[PDB]
Design a protein around this ligand. Structure first.
Ligand SMILES: *[C@@H]1O[C@H](CO)[C@@H](O[C@@H]2O[C@H](CO)[C@@H](O[C@@H]3O[C@H](CO[C@H]4O[C@H](CO[C@H]5O[C@H](CO)[C@@H](O)[C@H](O)[C@@H]5O)[C@@H](O)[C@H](O[C@H]5O[C@H](CO)[C@@H](O)[C@H](O)[C@@H]5O)[C@@H]4O)[C@@H](O)[C@H](O[C@H]4O[C@H](CO)[C@@H](O)[C@H](O)[C@@H]4O)[C@@H]3O)[C@H](O)[C@H]2NC(C)=O)[C@H](O)[C@H]1NC(C)=O
Ligand SMILES: *[C@@H]1O[C@H](CO)[C@@H](O[C@@H]2O[C@H](CO)[C@@H](O[C@@H]3O[C@H](CO[C@H]4O[C@H](CO)[C@@H](O)[C@H](O)[C@@H]4O)[C@@H](O)[C@H](O[C@H]4O[C@H](CO)[C@@H](O)[C@H](O)[C@@H]4O)[C@@H]3O)[C@H](O)[C@H]2NC(C)=O)[C@H](O)[C@H]1NC(C)=O
Ligand SMILES: *[C@@H]1O[C@H](CO)[C@@H](O[C@@H]2O[C@H](CO)[C@@H](O[C@@H]3O[C@H](CO[C@H]4O[C@H](CO)[C@@H](O)[C@H](O[C@H]5O[C@H](CO)[C@@H](O)[C@H](O)[C@@H]5O)[C@@H]4O)[C@@H](O)[C@H](O)[C@@H]3O)[C@H](O)[C@H]2NC(C)=O)[C@H](O)[C@H]1NC(C)=O
Ligand SMILES: *[C@@H]1O[C@H](CO)[C@@H](O[C@@H]2O[C@H](CO)[C@@H](O[C@@H]3O[C@H](CO[C@H]4O[C@H](CO)[C@@H](O)[C@H](O)[C@@H]4O)[C@@H](O)[C@H](O)[C@@H]3O)[C@H](O)[C@H]2NC(C)=O)[C@H](O)[C@H]1NC(C)=O
Length: 587
């Protein structure tokens, strides 16, 4: 899209808005950002659960100047809990009306643990255990972890560990486990609060007599019951898998995939090889993953169907259509999702069914067509692509104006660059009908287009690799049926800064004055900076250290001076580094 300054007539456009699922803190004076841009003063208003919400009536709520950002003050009192639900921001002006996402405003809850009577659980030496947390309802899912009442972080290793769900898992209980209590703890991000479940205790029943006394045993599956399970993760998300075993000799978990090698760049082991995590996920990663609980006595596999589904994501987001009277335009709302996301069309937040009828407007599948567009039907169109999992919302408006091409950058720019480096000329422009911009060099009639000259949407001209021929005066002209505008830029190819004589690596004894030569070629008409780095951090010039134009001298070396010195020669357009190692002997 293209931006418009304030002075020029402009429909509304939302700069910044809060999250769809906006979660908040009960303490703070609560603030909701809704900011819009519009040459004619936009007016802002709000709606909760599909019913208007009156700001003036509520004394606590007040509005920022020249924006729709709302602030609520709790000094008097009151409670955020009563404000939960779906809210919507509306920014209106003469030209049109712009909407925002439906904000599922909820306040983070940090409920205390229900005081429950806990009998300590018992077990014979070396049987498996599943220690259950089951927190009270938590939005968001709290940070779960296990602590002693003595406040010490609790023994976690290959043998025994915690799940993502929050329960603790013992492949095999040992004698030592009785030493301490185990208490579940949950953090809530927003309030910075931790909840502690009543601590557990265990009892062990070794009967072994004096006379590896305890019996050995097969592995078994504990968390993923049965052979098979299904998990769904959305595209682009972090994928996480877990496998829990139970064998007297501590089982070892290995992870693999159906007829294919694991992408090592993205996958990694967490939680002592009992968790596997991947980075951004694609349909590549979709398929069948399984896990082995290898053990000396037996070994077993669990399979998981990893169907990579997706909340809708934009393939082609509809961008603003600028048309001259009688030009043809189409709006494309294409979101990819698994299952396929359902497309929903509204006109200024009104159902298309009952919208004012228009002959130019034709709707088909997911696309809207205006043939021979006129002043009529100038409004903001909305697309809600939604599925079981999630939804995406997109706005697009059409503005009709009649103005000649305008120049948006400084006149007579001066641009500098070295020989074989990529460069860019920024000549931004704009016009009511799409004006053709053309480049001219050294007063040549022929417009510059083709090899080694490329033009983008905004008008910046890129030189992929520069020759000495390219240097000179460039004129960019934006023109259309209505009128024209012109602008000048001078392009200068200068000489790169390269270090032809590097400092010499050397071995010196204590109390000798040493010199390092760093000769660099730079263009005479350029700002050169030459500094040094000791080891791997910047060096400070001082007493006993003399800096010559092309060399550096140190008096009175010792063992501390030993190391790597780095000559840095930089100009506005270029940078080069040279390194030398100095070693020191003893007396
Ligand atoms: C873009 O479109 C998408 C959808 O395509 C839309 O997302 C929907 O958003 C609304 C509003 O937030 C969600 O509706 C909520 O529904 C709550 C009850 O959940 C049940 O009903 C859901 C559908 O709501 C309709 O039916 C209910 C009665 O069922 C009715 O109250 C509503 O008014 C509405 O007519 C349904 O999706 C949901 O299904 C989930 O859970 C079931 C198990 O229960 C499970 O089987 C499903 O697989 C799924 O997981 C469930 O059946 C409702 O409580 C809530 O508010 C209502 O109650 C309050 C309090 O009484 C009232 O004040 C209020 O008026 C409502 O009556 C709300 O209505 C809906 O669930 C979303 N749909 C999907 C698919 O996610 C986006 O918002 C759209 N985007 C934009 C920008 O508009
Ligand atoms: C103007 O634009 C040009 C072109 O874009 C820039 O040239 C780049 O300069 C950097 C150095 O800043 C080059 O990085 C070089 O990497 C070499 C190894 O390259 C291979 O392997 C890398 C991955 O490691 C691949 O990406 C690449 O394709 C190659 O296959 C090193 O050997 C280089 O170091 C040595 O030579 C340089 C020469 O300048 C010396 O100064 C060093 O001291 C050292 O002796 C170097 O690190 C990069 O490859 C260049 N090309 C590109 C496309 O980036 C200019 O930096 C830029 N500015 C100017 C010219 O002033
Ligand atoms: C997960 O996120 C990443 C990061 O956003 C996504 O990576 C983008 O992938 C697309 C599609 O391939 C890329 O478009 C390509 O760009 C290539 C240029 O890449 C060079 O420069 C990169 C830095 O800009 C550099 O990282 C890369 O080196 C790495 O990959 C090389 C691939 O050959 C490999 O040889 C190297 O060893 C190193 O691992 C290259 O030097 C270009 O060559 C292609 O033709 C194509 O245009 C984007 O550039 C990637 N993003 C970025 C920031 O570079 C990835 O797709 C995401 N995956 C999923 C599943 O969502
Ligand atoms: C008109 O549209 C043109 C579309 O191509 C614009 O040309 C592009 O201009 C940009 C901005 O100067 C150039 O971006 C370059 O990016 C490199 C690398 O980025 C560095 O910084 C990022 C920060 O995230 C970092 O991730 C990278 O690793 C790099 O460290 C910079 O080194 C360059 O200086 C420059 O910023 C593009 O190169 C250029 N297009 C192409 C294809 O090269 C043009 O700017 C637009 N005109 C206007 C007025 O907006």
């Amino acid at each position: 899209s293209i931006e418009i300054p304030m002075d020029l007539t402009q429909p509304p456009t939302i700069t910044k808005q809060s999250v769809k699922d906006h979660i908040v803190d009960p303490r703070d004076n609560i603030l909701i950002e809704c900011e819009a841009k519009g040459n004619p003063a936009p007016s802002f208003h709000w709606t909760r659960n599909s019913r208007f919400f009156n700001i003036a009536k509520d004394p606590r709520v007040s509005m920022r100047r020249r924006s729709g950002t709302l602030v609520i003050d709790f000094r008097s009192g009151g409670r955020p809990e009563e404000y939960e639900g779906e809210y919507q921001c509306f920014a209106r002006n003469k030209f049109g009306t712009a909407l925002s996402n439906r904000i599922r405003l909820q306040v983070s809850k940090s409920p205390l643990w229900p005081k429950e009577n806990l009998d300590p659980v018992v077990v014979q030496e070396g049987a498996p255990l599943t220690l259950q947390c089951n927190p009270p309802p938590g939005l968001p899912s709290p940070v779960i972890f296990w602590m002693s009442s003595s406040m010490e972080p609790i023994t976690q290793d290959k043998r025994v560990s915690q799940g993502h769900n929050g329960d603790l898992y013992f492949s095999n209980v040992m004698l030592q486990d009785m030493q301490t209590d185990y208490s579940c703890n949950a953090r809530f991000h927003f309030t910075h609060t931790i909840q502690q479940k009543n601590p557990f205790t265990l009892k062990v029943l070794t009967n072994n007599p004096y006379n590896r006394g305890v019996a050995e045993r097969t592995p078994s599956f504990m968390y993923p019951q049965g052979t098979s399970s299904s998990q769904m993760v959305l595209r682009g998300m972090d994928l996480l898998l877990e496998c829990i075993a139970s064998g007297v000799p501590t089982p070892d978990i290995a992870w693999y995939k159906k007829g294919g090698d694991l992408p090592s760049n993205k996958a990694k082991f967490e939680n002592f090889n009992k968790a596997l995590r991947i980075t951004n996920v694609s349909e590549e990663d979709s398929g069948e993953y399984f896990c082995l609980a290898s053990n000396k006595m037996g070994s077993i596999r669990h399979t998981i169907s990893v169907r990579v589904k997706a909340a809708p994501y934009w393939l082609d987001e509809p961008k603003n259509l600028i048309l001259a009277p009688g030009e043809d335009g189409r709006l494309v709302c294409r979101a990819n999702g698994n299952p396929k996301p359902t497309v929903q069309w509204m006109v200024n937040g009104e159902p298309l069914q009952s919208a004012p009828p228009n002959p130019n407007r034709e709707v088909a599948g997911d696309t809207i067509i205006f043939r021979d567009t006129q002043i009529s039907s100038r409004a903001v169109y909305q697309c809600n692509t939604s599925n079981e999992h999630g939804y995406l919302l997109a706005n697009a408006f059409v503005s009709v104006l009649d103005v000649p091409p305008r120049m948006l950058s400084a006149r007579n720019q001066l641009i500098r660059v070295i020989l074989y480096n990529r460069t860019r000329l920024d000549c931004p422009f704009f016009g009511s009908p799409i004006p053709t911009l053309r480049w001219f060099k050294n007063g040549q009639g022929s417009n510059l287009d083709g090899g080694n000259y490329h033009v983008y949407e905004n008008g910046s001209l890129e030189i992929k690799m520069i020759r000495k021929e390219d240097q000179g005066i460039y004129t960019c002209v934006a023109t259309n049926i209505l009128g024209k505008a012109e602008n000048q830029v001078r392009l200068e190819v200068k000489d790169p800064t390269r270090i032809y004589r590097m400092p010499e690596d050397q071995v010196a004894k204590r109390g000798t004055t040493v010199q390092l030569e760093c000769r660099v070629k730079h263009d005479p008409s350029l700002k050169l900076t030459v500094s040094w780095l000791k080891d791997d951090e910047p060096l400070y010039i001082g007493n006993r250290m003399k800096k010559e134009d092309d060399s550096l001298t140190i008096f009175g070396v010792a063992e501390r001076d030993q190391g790597s010195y780095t000559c840095m020669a930089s100009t506005e357009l270029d940078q080069d580094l040279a390194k030398a190692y100095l070693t020191v002997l003893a007396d």
